[PDB]
Symmetry: C2
Subunit: 67 residues, 2 copies
């Protein structure tokens, strides 16, 4: 994000912990594995939101310097 | 998430990748870094949302197999 990458790295360290404990819970409760992919696919769409702001941050904020 | 850990691990590759490219844009545009940590803090808060699901999945969805 800025040169303080450490908060973003902690954010995805924390998602790495969380996705492992969610998968221990899967193997423990035995909920259908289709609801779990939709839970992963929404963690991934929040990162697709971060891809969308990024292609806007290069194209459009470089264009804040232009206009 | 389920034992397909891969779909979520690739979600956080793609964030790790994006957050570095967003830091390249920081060194280039020189937009004030307080917008960038608000961008980081919202990426983080989407993982807090995932923490809040998971504590509800162990406490409350393990109790869903109970009752």
């Amino acid at each position: 994000m800025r040169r303080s990458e450490v908060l973003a790295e902690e954010s995805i360290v924390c998602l790495q912990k969380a996705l492992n404990h969610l998968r221990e819970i899967w193997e423990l409760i035995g909920i259908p594995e289709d609801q779990r992919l939709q839970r992963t696919e929404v963690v991934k769409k929040h990162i697709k939101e971060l891809l969308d702001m990024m292609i806007a941050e290069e194209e459009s904020l470089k264009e804040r310097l232009e206009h």
